[PDB]
């Protein structure tokens, strides 16, 4: 069922391959990379999570203090009020951190295999309450007014999407938090529909709901209202559990194709595809049955939790869709897929 | 503690005192009343709950088809799938379902007291998917341009907030889900700051967070962004489980007056106040400590699972705040508050 040409290199980057960004942390995980191309190179704009050197039996942690100021949470392993079940996020007598934390890296690449940092474009880091616990999983939007950048904003407060904007990827606009909690997996359309912007988005309900794919619309991309559900998680299927949006939607003749990430309640993610009307992006054409891509590899399954694909950024050339994805969140990978053997299936 | 004066006629209006507006229902709850003044009248948009007589032994209750025609679910009380802890929202096999169906229903009054229907206005019922679970807590923003209501639509897919607007309460222009699940408590402000429109909302986070009152701004009024977080709850205080702001701020020269509703993990609920800066009312300038109304009569302790106070409307003459408000979900109420009293405690 698996219709995706891994890249033979892959992985491509890894934790080791890179020096840390932040002082005295080591890189614990690079993944889930925005994907674009600028000055002839093709870049990766690069999620790199960090902590401190773990000692046995200690979850250890950075977050911002009071001052600004990086600072290191400890909590024992064998606490009664811990709760790490999910090592990802933990609880602590009510209160919820994150393991490690998260911030946006720029690599370039002639080839598209062999990346490396560029002098001059540093990378992009949290500011602010609502980034106090840092940046994650960073859509970019190649428009005809520039690049636009759409992320994860994690605090105590709020998971919420923020939004950027830049034409140098040197000088930024920051537009705030432009969705509120709790949302994540915002894929802005690169071109405007009946004179306005459109998203995707991926709101949680605590009940009455659940994890689906949502439309919202806006006229200066800043403010966003008019909500549609587009698609929801199907009782049975590999995407029962949460659905969410990768990269922007490709244009085809046939609509809107998206490549979408579902999980089931092992945390088993794959990727499949939605298909959309042109004029109206919430009403659904068609929908891949199975997924389109599967953790098969073995560096898809080196997890800490469960095998996990995970896209949201992509290159086109005519019927070529190449895609960066994040493996077992640990490593960055590639692979290529046909529209056409997509849009077969979705018939 | 409790600064509230009641009136003596509390409660204005009963389930039983007014005949039901869906085919084949009783009236089970009136509760959660938006104000607003009209035609030299005083009007109440009541939340009306509904839902056919029970049979022993099994919980039914009325939704909104595909085709938008009225239908009863019905469940076994001793079925070992259904979840009926909660009495107003219940689980069974993971999706979630109301009790009742909610519609708001326009009562006028010369007095302000004694409340009768009007001929030639009919009560507003849900449309389409999203209001597929019916509509609740209507705020009524009474501005420069008309009546701009800020109400939740309820669906399995969402509990999120819609907007209306009217000039003469017969004619109804619909701006669709302006905030996305999971959302409520919407007050918008009755005018605008510095060339912008501003409302408090109130998002639900699964995790990374809890149920705090957020700021959001728009241009136009259908499209919101820049969000930002308000104020929390409290650990320790009566305001522990949840925290929503009631009607739209009092503006006053010590800032914005904001009559809020916290409720602790015993779902007791309270009134507080909240004072913020006019130019920024994100920045908070006061608080209440301790609540500034308690469910103290007897009619505010007869719940089906804990003491309820809850008001999303008021009338505003000089000193006096003449609230209207819910008790026990189940009738409606009236009560006075001094602006100069609360601002006394308030430093
Ligand atoms: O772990 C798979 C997948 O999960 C989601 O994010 C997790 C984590 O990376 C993130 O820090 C927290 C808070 O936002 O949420 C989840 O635990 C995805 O959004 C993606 O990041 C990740 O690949
Ligand atoms: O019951 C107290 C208080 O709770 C909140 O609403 C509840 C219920 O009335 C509503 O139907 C569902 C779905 O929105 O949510 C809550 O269970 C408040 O918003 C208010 O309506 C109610 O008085």
Same mark, same amino acid.
């Given at each position: 069922?698996?219709?995706?040409?891994?890249?033979?290199?892959?992985? !491509?980057?890894?934790?080791?391959?890179?020096?840390?960004?932040?002082? $005295?942390?080591?890189?614990?995980? !690079?993944?889930? +990379?925005?994907?674009?191309? %600028?000055?002839?190179?093709?870049?990766?704009?690069?999620?790199?999570?960090? *902590? +401190?050197?773990?000692? =046995?039996? &200690?979850?250890?942690?950075? &977050?911002?203090?009071?001052?600004?100021?990086?600072?290191?949470?400890?909590?024992?392993? /064998?606490?009664?009020? !811990? @709760?790490?079940?999910? +090592?990802?996020? #933990?609880?602590?007598?009510?209160?919820?951190?994150?393991?490690?934390?998260?911030?946006? *890296?720029?690599?370039?690449?002639? $080839?598209? &295999?062999?990346?490396?940092?560029?002098?001059?474009?540093?990378?992009?880091?949290?500011?602010?309450?609502?980034?106090?616990?840092?940046?994650?999983?960073?859509?970019?939007?190649?428009?005809?007014?520039?690049?636009?950048?759409?992320?994860?904003?994690?605090?105590?407060?709020?998971?919420?999407?923020?939004?950027?904007?830049? /034409?140098?990827?040197?000088?930024?606009?920051?537009?705030?938090?432009?969705?509120?909690?709790?949302?994540?997996?915002?894929?802005? %359309?690169?071109?405007?529909?009946? $004179?306005?912007?459109?998203?995707?988005? *991926?709101?949680?309900?605590? =009940?009455?709901?659940?994890?689906?794919?949502? !439309?919202?619309?806006?006229?200066?991309?800043?403010?966003?209202?008019?909500?549609?559900?587009?698609?929801?998680? *199907?009782?049975?299927?590999?995407?029962?559990?949460?659905?969410?949006?990768?990269?922007?939607? #490709?244009?085809?003749?046939?609509?809107?194709?998206?490549?979408?990430?579902?999980?089931? %309640? /092992?945390?088993?993610?794959?990727?499949?595809?939605?298909?959309? @009307?042109?004029?109206?992006?919430?009403?659904?054409?068609?929908?891949?049955?199975?997924?389109?891509?599967?953790?098969?590899?073995?560096?898809?399954?080196?997890?800490?939790?469960?095998?996990?694909?995970?896209? /949201?950024?992509?290159?086109?050339?005519?019927?070529?869709?190449?895609?960066?994805?994040?493996?077992? @969140?640990?490593?960055?990978?590639?692979?290529?897929?046909?529209?056409? =053997?997509?849009?077969?299936?979705?018939?």
């Amino acid at each position: 069922m698996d219709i995706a040409k891994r890249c033979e290199s892959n992985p !491509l980057l890894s934790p080791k391959d890179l020096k840390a960004g932040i002082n $005295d942390m080591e890189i614990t995980c !690079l993944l889930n +990379p925005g994907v674009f191309k %600028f000055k002839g190179k093709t870049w990766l704009l690069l999620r790199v999570a960090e *902590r +401190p050197v773990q000692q =046995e039996g &200690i979850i250890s942690f950075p &977050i911002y203090d009071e001052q600004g100021q990086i600072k290191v949470m400890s909590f024992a392993e /064998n606490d009664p009020d !811990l @709760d790490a079940s999910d +090592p990802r996020v #933990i609880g602590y007598k009510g209160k919820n951190y994150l393991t490690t934390m998260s911030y946006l *890296r720029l690599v370039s690449s002639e $080839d598209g &295999i062999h990346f490396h940092d560029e002098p001059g474009y540093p990378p992009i880091f949290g500011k602010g309450e609502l980034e106090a616990f840092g940046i994650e999983d960073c859509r970019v939007a190649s428009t005809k007014d520039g690049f636009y950048l759409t992320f994860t904003e994690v605090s105590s407060v709020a998971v919420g999407v923020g939004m950027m904007h830049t /034409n140098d990827w040197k000088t930024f606009e920051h537009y705030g938090m432009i969705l509120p909690p709790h949302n994540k997996d915002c894929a802005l %359309f690169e071109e405007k529909i009946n $004179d306005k912007y459109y998203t995707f988005h *991926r709101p949680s309900s605590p =009940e009455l709901g659940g994890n689906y794919i949502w !439309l919202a619309e806006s006229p200066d991309l800043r403010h966003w209202g008019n909500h549609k559900c587009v698609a929801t998680t *199907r009782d049975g299927f590999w995407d029962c559990a949460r659905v969410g949006a990768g990269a922007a939607p #490709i244009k085809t003749e046939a609509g809107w194709l998206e490549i979408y990430h579902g999980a089931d %309640f /092992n945390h088993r993610y794959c990727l499949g595809a939605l298909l959309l @009307d042109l004029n109206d992006p919430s009403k659904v054409l068609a929908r891949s049955k199975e997924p389109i891509m599967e953790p098969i590899a073995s560096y898809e399954q080196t997890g800490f939790f469960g095998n996990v694909i995970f896209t /949201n950024g992509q290159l086109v050339d005519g019927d070529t869709i190449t895609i960066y994805y994040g493996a077992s @969140d640990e490593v960055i990978c590639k692979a290529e897929l046909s529209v056409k =053997e997509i849009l077969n299936i979705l018939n």
